[PDB]
Design a protein around this ligand. Structure first.
Ligand code: CL
Ligand code: CL
Ligand code: MG
Ligand code: MG
Ligand code: MG
Ligand code: MG
Ligand code: MG
Lengths: 196, 241, 226, 250, 204, 244, 231, 195, 243
């Protein structure tokens, strides 16, 4: 799995590959790893598919009940709910989740929740098995307040390299853009990103 | 005469505590009305702010239960909010368990079943409220379902609740006797709200300012309440013809 | 076991082989692996056979009660949500690997679900020991906008690949077609390409071949009157 | 909090009467008339859809309910009590039978389970009895067609034909004169409609009358084909049009 | 150590023309030691017959459990349980112990009293139903029984021909299994008569 | 709080009587009469259904006589729904005993168990007692044919002939007059029907108002048979004994 | 009247009669006085005997090295409440290495007593308490009522005829608050205060009970010949 | 413990049980009676894990004595053996199972027949003409298979039992310190004090 | 009759008399008020000096919940403390799960549902307090008042206790004369005056004034007690207005 979320001038973009493996067998080559827990709060999932789906479904339930009572939740609040589930059940979970969201007050925000259940607010985050191969590239190429087109290129190039070297990553590159304008889904096929 | 204090049968086969809970329903002296359009369901309710020290924005008997379901309550606010919190919890749990949004009629039945339990179990009292649930259901379309302290519920073409419900009901009955259809044949919800307000004015014989009303509107995939300025625009259109 | 699911124009088709095994021994040669959750929601199971049956019937029971409670025809997403939450709770110990397909007022659906409770969406899916043989066929011949006839053909071909190439699969092909606005048609033994040839010899014994010590009538009737 | 009513609310009076059960039966007496008639090849259950308001959509209020594919129920008395009993009856048909034997319960045993639930509300702590009488019609392979009445006490009796609620006394006399052991299902429906007309004041048509039958298997209502042994439900609710057709031959 | 092969034993069931047959060996052992030659593994509740192989304590326990349940069934239903219904009851009862199972291999045999149709069924220790048209096998010599039945069996055998087939299937299977034998019983079941026959076989 | 509404179902009167038990017995005195008569070669159970209708489906109806197992049956007087709760519990106890000891439950052990359950509701729990009196007819290989009765107090006693329900005073006097120890089942059948015919509050005793059962060793050889009489069989025995 | 059957029932004027009846038990109890300066806090208690053969019922209970109380009313209820205080003082020391503030001790007693006034089945406590202590903010005196009301005071008295002692302390307020660094004079003021509540009987050697806590003084109780000095 | 044997003859059941109690290195006792009288005509011998054997046996004894008092009636040997089997079958799926194997020798006064039941710690019950637990059967069953007759007298049963014990004393590595022998018949239970 | 002997029983009117009797206990209590200002809220309460022996400034009545909410109440003081303890648990669990401090409307409903729950059963007694509370959250200032029935609304100004009628009239003047709004420092002064004016209903004994406030500019949105010079300035302003 190669996943990442990157804040930029107009908000935040989440990115992911589409490969799900059982050992060396690709059980699903068109997986959607970008998950909606609220209208403009999404997450990228890595680790146990069963665990991250179970967690995400519970978070979506919590934020739906939050919204009915207290109105739209912040991205920080969503990250906190994720963290509560991951930290308190750390012994029984294998989940690495990146939470990304857009407020109008706070704009684009990214939180990463690694295996232990700690929370880290970052300008951008990378995770999954494929992320190891792009720490150098992403650190060298990330800038704050990029444009939408620049951020799409940064994620496309980053995940391209992660896919190239990591056998557990592959398929299509999916992206979800979170801004004031709304929610936009993007997809990029092998013939596009392999020639980069 | 302790058959009047708890929910057990009187010699006539009556439940007096249920009957008295129906009487508590009119304690707020507020009338509500609900009607269905082609694409929408509209609910209006009288808004009375008798104290100048009150923040009028917090005085409400309309609730946003889920994204799709709205609920207006006739009765005291403590029992209203009790029912509101439960309905919100039930709607959220339903979505989590069964993977789709709780329908308006199903929520009404669920809250009606809970109410039924209070009429049979002695330690629980009935809630002194009548709950009108509204939505545009993905299967049934525009929907009005109303629940009472007896645990009764039923779907409505249109409905009215409050001290002067009979006047509003007869007014609505007479209109649907003319039109011979089960809804307001109108494209926009704005005009369905205008219909609702007009027929409440006719039935009650009173005029309304923007602060005298409270309006909820259900459309496909969302329920929302109108602001005082949205209602003002509605009142202006009514007066201009 | 080989099970597949294939989406088409106006619905979805699922298929399965009919061999069940303990180890290297074939327990049943004509096993029914297509299970009904509700009239128009069917699923096929691989893994522990009792678990696939039990989890189907439990969710199928609760789906029926839910349908009566809500006065609505059951949805595939409801079956999926109830199945996954049940399976996740038991942390993979209930060894049910299912392909869940069906039609409802929302449309036609195809999902897979693993024993740990992870789920998948797709236009074509395969599960079981013969899933790699089946997926090879699906990946070679699947296209968008398949007709009903093309989807049945593709599904049964994918099962055949499992039958012939996977030792865990064999015998017959079962198919169930779920089309929007129609009754689901269950096609038991849709293909029968493995009928045993006539034996060289009859092994019917002469009467009195077996040595007998005692004979007696067994009273299966209740205590009698008079 | 906690339910601190752990004592019986129904108790024996000096005369030996169980007051709360008697009063529950009084509530049933006030209820709208419902009836059941058993024929040789089916059972019919019927009642009036007493609409509380003309603005109400009475099709959304089901007085006649499917319990299993071959068992249906109707009531007289308190509607909400009936609705929750239907929910419990549907569930108990699964939990205490179908999940054990892989088949739906026979009519008499489902009736027995419903009766047990109603008996317990008559003895358990901090509850009142259910204010309904039920008429349950059904079919099963080994018992054939049957019709049962269940009262607030939990007592149940099998009937050839009967009525409960408002005008039951007059209706039962009407049924006694008309019933024989050679009736076909259509004859029973005809008698049901005749009997029900006497207790109905206002409109009498397919929109104000609710009627269902337990009869032949309906393969068209099964939802799937391919299993020869599965032939469809025997319970079928008659449409508004189907009722009106038989009201011309009345 | 393996609970399903401590005591040993086998059951086999077959269908014929308007009849069914169910048969079992009589051995109970403690691994290598032969303990009893009178341990019958076939029971009946009304007209429904149940064979049970595996761990002997569970064989006895389940017989008592199904006697218990079919007796209550009869009192409430006012009729004897049928093979199809009983098969579901066995499955339900086994699966309720999903994570602490009875170590058994049950086999149901009987004729439906209303339809007259012959019925047989097999189960794994956890309740999965094998409803074969031809034959069901169970026990420590199930491989041997599969080999015998697959070659010896032919459909629509008359009761007295079916007896010879099932007897020879059991006997020769048991003689290739160390933990089966020490006597054998065969039930021939018709709609309203059942005959029970004890077979003569080698006692080693 | 809740104390206000508590009837206190398990208290003594100043005279040392249990109010609810006494009032439950009053209830039972209005139920249809049930009679049990024990003979040397079997037991007879006869009972009157309460004012019936012509539309009642009698052949599938059961309100008085119930089977507990193959050897033991009961006649009921009181609330039928209450009785069925206890009857199911008794059926389970019998099967629990059979599973434990691999022998049919002795009649008295079953009777004591049900009677102890009734007793519990009079001493603890604050619930109303079961408004039911049973006549137990049964056979075991220790005491042979046995008749017992139990009432809402949980007290039980053994009998040669006994009645419960309505007009027990008149019924018991009639039984005491004509009962003899060397009596046979066919004689007991006649006594039971004659007693009901005289004590009934109905105008005449007919087949549709009766439930009838016999427990006989009239089962072929060393075993016992229960016979719940069919409506036609009750009609025949009424003609045979010369009541209709 | 119709509203005094239990603690869960308000009267039509908004009164809780069971709580008021519990308050009445304190008025029947023997007099006890509390007063403090800026360095020390003192409890003085008139102990009551059953007869001439009997002992004099103890009135003062130590809760910690820095805190303790005197009681008036049902003595077993004081034992329950003082035990609870002992535990809370102890919890504070063990978990936080911190001596429990006297004001916080009052808050805990209030909340414990309150739960018995709003629930069915229970009853209010039938005892009044005077809590003295020396913590990080100096000397303190609290008065506890079983209604839940806890009040911080310079001086007070509860029990029968306590009004006489309370008026005296109200007069002497400006004098006894200034008795700093002189334990004996502060006790004298307390013994003189409790004397304004005596009738027919006087303070004897087994009648009088005195407690003191202060800056460099652990909570200690004086009985017997230890109080003869003050008689 | 170690060797327990049982033989049902014409009119009685004979139970033989070893006397040794060994705790690892040392033989602590050589006169231990590994049996309990459950009722006047029912005897149970036992062997298995230390502590559990006596605890189980006395628990069963207490239950059968309780039944006898409540009903004023002695349960048949079959009924007692069924009760014991259920307790062990219940026990085997407990948190800590009873590791106890038993023989139940009883004389049925109703049928006028001796009866011997063998039940292991799993709840495996069999009615036998002769039985054993542990390795005892490996040495003795070939002798019993040869000489046993269903019409044997009590004296002949004791003589066949002596031959079995002699073969055990010859070929078994462990010194079990002889056996206590008890006879169960119509007159009750008695111990053979010279064997 | 007998409908007023048990909580949660509906009278033939549809009234819960036990709740109405709880109101009588509230009306018997001392005067407490709340004033919503431009960027916060001000709370004030009358503390009756029963005796000279009461230590001044020690028996604090106003209570903080979390760090941004103030609570004051009239009636049975212990009941108010019980309600605040519950409020503190509600606020803690909200922050634990959602990270952000509990919004004031959210907190209002938590108290509301809890008080309403004590009108559902006869095994509990209704709360004998009306509670005025509020503070600053992400959407600004909020002031609430909660009754024994569980009923609560948002307020511009709020008053309860024995001198509530007097106080309400004073609050209504401020609302009319300041449609643009009142500053936090002005609200503290006005709160002092209103308590002094409302003390006429309790004129027998003298009293002690206690004021607190949460303001975005003056206290950084945190609840703080008005102490020392600022308190004395408010007391002087109040004493000047009554003369
Ligand atoms: Cl990381
Ligand atoms: Cl519900
Ligand atoms: Mg790759
Ligand atoms: Mg109630
Ligand atoms: Mg896991
Ligand atoms: Mg062999
Ligand atoms: Mg051998």
């Amino acid at each position: 799995t190669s996943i990442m979320a990157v804040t930029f001038k107009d908000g935040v973009i989440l990115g992911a590959d589409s490969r799900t493996t059982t050992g060396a067998y690709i059980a699903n080559r068109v997986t959607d790893k970008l998950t909606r827990v609220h209208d403009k709060i999404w997450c990228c999932r890595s680790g146990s598919a069963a665990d991250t789906q179970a967690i995400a479904d519970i978070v979506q339930y919590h934020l739906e009940l939050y919204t009915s009572q207290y109105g739209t939740p912040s991205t920080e609040t969503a990250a906190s709910v994720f963290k509560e589930l991951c930290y308190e059940n750390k012994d029984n979970l294998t989940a690495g989740i990146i939470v990304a969201g857009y407020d109008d007050k706070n704009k684009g925000e990214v939180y990463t929740i690694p295996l232990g259940g700690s929370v880290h607010k970052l300008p951008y985050a990378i995770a999954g098995s494929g992320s190891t191969f792009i720490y150098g590239y992403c650190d060298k190429n990330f800038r704050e307040n990029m444009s939408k087109e620049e951020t799409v290129d940064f994620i496309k190039h980053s995940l391209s390299q992660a896919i190239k070297w990591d056998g557990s990553s592959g398929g299509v590159i999916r992206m979800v853009v979170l801004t004031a304008a709304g929610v936009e889904r993007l997809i990029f096929y092998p013939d596009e990103y392999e020639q980069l | 005469g302790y058959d009047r204090h708890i929910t057990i049968f009187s010699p006539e086969g009556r439940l007096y505590q249920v009957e008295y809970a129906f009487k508590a329903t009119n304690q707020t002296n507020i009338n509500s009305l609900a009607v269905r359009g082609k694409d929408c369901t509209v609910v209006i309710s009288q808004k009375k702010v008798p104290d100048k020290l009150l923040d009028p924005t917090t005085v409400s008997y309309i609730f946003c239960i889920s994204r799709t379901i709205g609920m207006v309550v006739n009765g005291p606010i403590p029992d209203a909010r009790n029912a509101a919190l439960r309905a919100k919890a039930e709607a959220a749990e339903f979505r989590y368990k069964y993977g789709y949004d709780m329908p308006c009629d199903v929520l009404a039945k669920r809250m009606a079943n809970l109410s039924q339990i209070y009429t049979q179990r002695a330690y629980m009292r009935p809630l002194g409220v009548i709950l009108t649930f509204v939505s545009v259901d993905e299967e049934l379309g525009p929907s009005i379902y109303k629940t009472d302290p007896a645990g009764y519920y039923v779907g409505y073409k249109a409905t009215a609740t409050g001290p002067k419900q009979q006047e509003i009901t007869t007014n609505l009955e007479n209109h649907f006797k003319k039109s011979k259809i089960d809804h307001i044949n109108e494209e926009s919800w704005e005009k369905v709200v205008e219909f609702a307000i007009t027929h409440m004015i006719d039935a009650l014989g009173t005029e309304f300012s923007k602060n005298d009303l409270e309006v909820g509107v259900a459309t496909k995939d969302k329920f929302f309440t109108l602001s005082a300025e949205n209602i003002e625009e509605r009142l202006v259109a009514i007066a201009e013809q | 076991t080989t099970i597949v699911g294939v989406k088409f124009n106006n619905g979805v088709v699922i298929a399965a082989d009919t061999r069940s095994t303990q180890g290297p021994i074939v327990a049943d040669k004509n096993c029914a692996k297509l299970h009904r959750i509700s009239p128009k929601i069917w699923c096929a199971g691989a893994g522990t056979a009792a678990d696939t049956e039990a989890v189907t019937q439990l969710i199928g029971s609760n789906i029926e009660l839910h349908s009566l409670y809500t006065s609505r025809e059951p949805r595939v997403v409801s079956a999926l949500q109830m199945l996954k939450q049940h399976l996740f709770k038991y942390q993979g110990h209930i060894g049910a690997y299912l392909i869940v397909a069906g039609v409802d007022p929302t449309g036609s659906h195809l999902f897979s679900i693993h024993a740990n409770g992870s789920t998948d969406v797709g236009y074509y899916l395969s599960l079981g020991s013969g899933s790699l043989a089946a997926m090879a066929v699906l990946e070679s011949h699947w296209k968008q906008d398949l007709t009903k006839e093309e989807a049945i053909k593709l599904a049964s071909d994918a099962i055949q690949a499992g039958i012939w190439n996977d030792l865990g699969s064999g015998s017959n092909v079962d198919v169930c077609v779920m089309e929007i606005g129609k009754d689901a048609e269950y096609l038991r033994n849709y293909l029968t390409p493995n009928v045993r040839e006539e034996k060289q010899k009859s092994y019917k014994f002469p009467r009195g071949t077996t040595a007998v010590l005692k004979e007696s009538i067994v009273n299966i009737c209740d205590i009698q009157e008079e | 909090m906690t339910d601190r009513y752990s004592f019986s609310l129904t108790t024996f009076s000096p005369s030996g009467k169980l007051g709360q059960i008697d009063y529950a039966l009084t509530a049933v007496k006030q209820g709208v008339t419902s009836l059941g008639i058993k024929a040789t090849n089916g059972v019919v259950i019927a009642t009036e859809k007493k609409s509380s308001s003309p603005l109400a959509m009475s099709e959304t209020l089901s007085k006649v309910s499917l319990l299993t594919p071959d068992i249906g129920a109707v009531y007289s008395g308190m509607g909400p009590d009936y609705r929750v009993l239907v929910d419990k009856s549907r569930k108990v048909a699964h939990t205490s039978y179908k999940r054990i034997y892989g088949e739906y319960p026979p009519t008499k045993l489902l009736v027995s389970e419903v009766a047990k639930i109603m008996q317990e509300a008559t003895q358990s702590g901090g509850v009142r009895p259910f204010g309904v009488s039920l008429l349950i019609a059904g079919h099963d392979e080994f018992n054939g067609f049957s019709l049962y009445q269940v009262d607030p006490s939990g007592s149940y009796f099998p009937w050839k034909a009967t009525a409960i609620g408002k005008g039951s006394v007059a209706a039962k006399t009407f049924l006694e004169k008309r019933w024989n052991d050679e009736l076909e299902l259509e004859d029973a429906i005809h008698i049901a409609l005749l009997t029900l007309k006497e207790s109905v004041e206002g409109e009498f048509n397919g929109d104000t009358i609710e009627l269902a039958i337990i009869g032949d298997e309906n393969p068209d209502l099964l939802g799937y084909t391919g299993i020869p042994t599965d032939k469809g439900p025997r319970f079928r609710k008659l449409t508004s049009q189907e009722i009106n057709d038989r009201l011309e031959a009345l | 150590s393996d609970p399903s092969s401590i005591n040993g034993g086998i059951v086999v069931a077959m269908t014929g023309k308007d009849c069914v047959a169910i048969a079992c060996d009589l051995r109970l052992g403690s691994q290598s030691l032969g303990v009893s030659n009178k341990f019958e593994k076939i029971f009946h509740y009304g007209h429904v017959f149940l064979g049970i192989t595996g761990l002997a304590t569970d064989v006895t326990t389940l017989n008592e459990m199904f006697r218990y349940k079919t007796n209550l069934y009869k009192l409430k239903e006012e009729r004897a349980i049928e093979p199809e219904t009983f098969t579901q009851l066995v499955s339900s009862s086994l699966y309720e112990r999903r994570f602490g199972p009875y170590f058994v291999g049950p086999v149901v045999a009987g004729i439906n009293s209303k339809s007259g149709k012959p019925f047989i069924a097999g189960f794994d220790l956890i309740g999965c139903i094998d409803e074969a048209k031809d034959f069901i096998v169970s026990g420590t010599a199930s491989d041997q029984l599969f080999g015998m039945c697959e070659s010896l069996y032919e459909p629509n055998l008359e009761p007295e021909d079916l007896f010879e087939t099932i007897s020879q299937a059991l006997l020769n299977a048991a003689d290739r299994d160390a933990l089966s034998g020490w006597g054998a019983v065969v039930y021939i079941i018709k709609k309203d008569e059942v005959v029970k026959r004890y077979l003569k076989m080698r006692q080693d | 709080g809740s104390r206000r509404y508590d009837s206190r179902t398990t208290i003594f009167s100043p005279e040392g009587r249990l109010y609810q038990v006494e009032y439950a017995l009053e209830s039972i005195s209005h139920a249809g009469t049930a009679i049990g008569i024990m003979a040397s070669d079997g037991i007879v159970l006869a009972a009157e259904r309460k004012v019936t209708s012509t539309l009642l489906e009698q052949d599938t109806s059961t309100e008085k006589l119930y089977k507990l197992n193959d050897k033991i049956a009961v006649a009921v007087a009181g609330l039928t729904a209450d009785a069925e709760i206890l009857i199911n519990t008794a059926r389970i106890h019998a099967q629990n005993y059979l599973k434990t000891y691999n022998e049919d439950i002795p009649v008295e052990i079953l009777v004591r168990r049900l009677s102890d359950i009734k007793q519990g509701y009079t001493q603890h729990g604050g619930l109303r007692p079961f408004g039911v009196s049973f006549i137990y007819a049964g056979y075991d290989d220790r005491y042979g044919y046995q008749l017992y009765t139990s009432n809402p107090s949980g007290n039980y006693t053994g009998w040669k002939a006994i009645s419960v329900g309505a007009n027990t005073s008149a019924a018991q006097t009639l039984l005491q007059m004509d009962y003899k120890d060397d009596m046979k089942v066919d004689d007991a059948i006649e006594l039971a029907l004659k007693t009901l015919s005289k004590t009934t509050d109905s105008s005449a005793l007919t087949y549709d108002r009766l439930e009838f059962a016999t427990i006989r060793k009239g089962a072929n050889d060393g075993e016992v048979y229960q016979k719940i009489f069919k409506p036609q069989e009750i009609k025949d025995i009424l003609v045979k004994t010369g009541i209709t | 009247n119709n509203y005094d059957g239990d603690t869960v029932t308000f009267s039509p004027t908004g009164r809780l009669f069971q709580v008021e009846y519990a308050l009445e038990a304190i008025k029947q109890g023997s007099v006890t006085v509390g007063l403090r300066s800026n360095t020390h806090a003192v409890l003085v208690a008139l102990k009551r005997n059953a007869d001439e053969l009997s002992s004099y019922q103890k009135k003062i209970i130590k809760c910690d090295e820095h805190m303790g109380l005197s009681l008036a009313g049902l003595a077993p209820d004081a034992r329950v409440l003082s035990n609870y205080l002992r535990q809370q003082c102890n919890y504070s020391s063990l978990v936080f290495n911190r001596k429990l503030a006297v004001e916080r001790a009052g808050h805990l007693l209030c909340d414990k007593a309150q739960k018995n006034t709003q629930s069915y089945g229970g009853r209010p406590y039938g005892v009044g308490l005077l809590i003295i202590g020396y913590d990080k903010s100096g000397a303190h005196l609290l008065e506890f009522q079983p209604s839940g009301n806890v009040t911080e005071l310079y001086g007070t008295a509860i029990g029968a005829r306590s009004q006489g002692a309370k008026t005296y302390l109200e007069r002497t307020l400006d004098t006894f608050i200034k008795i700093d660094g002189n334990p004996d004079e502060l006790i004298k003021a307390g013994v003189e205060a409790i004397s304004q509540s005596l009738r027919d009987e006087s303070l004897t050697v087994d009648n009088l009970s005195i407690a003191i806590v202060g800056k460099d003084t652990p909570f200690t109780i004086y009985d017997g010949e230890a109080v003869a000095k003050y008689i | 413990m170690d060797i327990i044997l049982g033989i049902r003859v014409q009119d009685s059941v004979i139970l033989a049980s070893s006397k040794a109690v060994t705790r690892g290195i040392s033989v602590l006792k050589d006169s231990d009676d590994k049996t309990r009288q459950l009722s006047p005509h029912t005897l149970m011998s036992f062997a298995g894990e230390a502590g559990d054997t006596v605890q189980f046996a006395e628990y069963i004894q207490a239950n059968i004595q309780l039944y006898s008092i409540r009903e004023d009636y002695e349960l048949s040997p079959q009924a007692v053996s069924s009760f014991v089997r259920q307790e062990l079958a219940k026990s085997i799926r407990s948190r800590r199972p009873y590791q106890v194997n038993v023989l139940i020798g009883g004389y049925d006064k109703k049928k006028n027949k001796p009866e011997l039941y063998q039940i292991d710690y799993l709840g495996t019950k069999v009615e036998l003409p002769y039985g054993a637990h542990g390795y005892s059967g490996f040495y003795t069953f070939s002798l019993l298979d040869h000489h046993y007759r269903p019409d044997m007298t009590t004296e002949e049963g004791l003589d066949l039992l002596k031959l079995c014990v002699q073969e055990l004393e010859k070929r078994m590595p462990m010194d079990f310190k002889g056996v206590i022998v008890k006879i169960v018949d119509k007159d009750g239970i008695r111990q053979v004090d010279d064997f | 009759t007998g409908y007023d002997l048990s909580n949660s029983v509906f009278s033939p009117d549809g009234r819960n008399f036990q709740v109405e009797y709880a109101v009588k206990a509230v009306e018997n209590g001392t005067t407490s008020i709340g004033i919503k200002c431009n960027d916060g809220v001000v709370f004030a309460v009358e503390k009756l000096i029963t005796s000279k022996l009461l230590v001044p400034q020690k028996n604090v009545k106003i209570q903080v919940v979390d760090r941004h909410i103030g609570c004051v109440y009239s009636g049975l003081i212990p009941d108010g403390r019980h309600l605040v303890n519950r409020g503190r648990e509600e606020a803690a669990s909200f922050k634990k799960l959602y990270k952000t401090p509990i919004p004031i409307p959210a907190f209002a409903d938590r108290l509301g549902q809890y008080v309403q729950a004590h009108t559902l059963y006869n095994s509990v007694r209704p709360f004998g307090v009306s509670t005025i509370f509020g503070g600053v959250d992400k959407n600004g200032a909020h002031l609430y008042m909660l009754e024994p029935s569980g009923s609560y609304w948002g307020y511009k100004g709020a008053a309860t206790g024995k001198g509530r009628q007097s106080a309400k009239a004073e609050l209504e003047k401020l609302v009319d004369h300041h449609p643009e709004g009142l500053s936090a420092r002005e609200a503290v002064k006005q709160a002092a005056k209103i308590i002094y004016l409302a003390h006429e209903d309790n004129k027998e004994k003298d009293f002690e004034l206690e004021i607190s406030w949460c303001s975005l500019s003056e206290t950084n949105g945190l609840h703080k007690f008005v102490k020392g010079d600022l308190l004395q300035e408010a007391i002087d302003f109040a004493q000047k207005e009554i003369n």
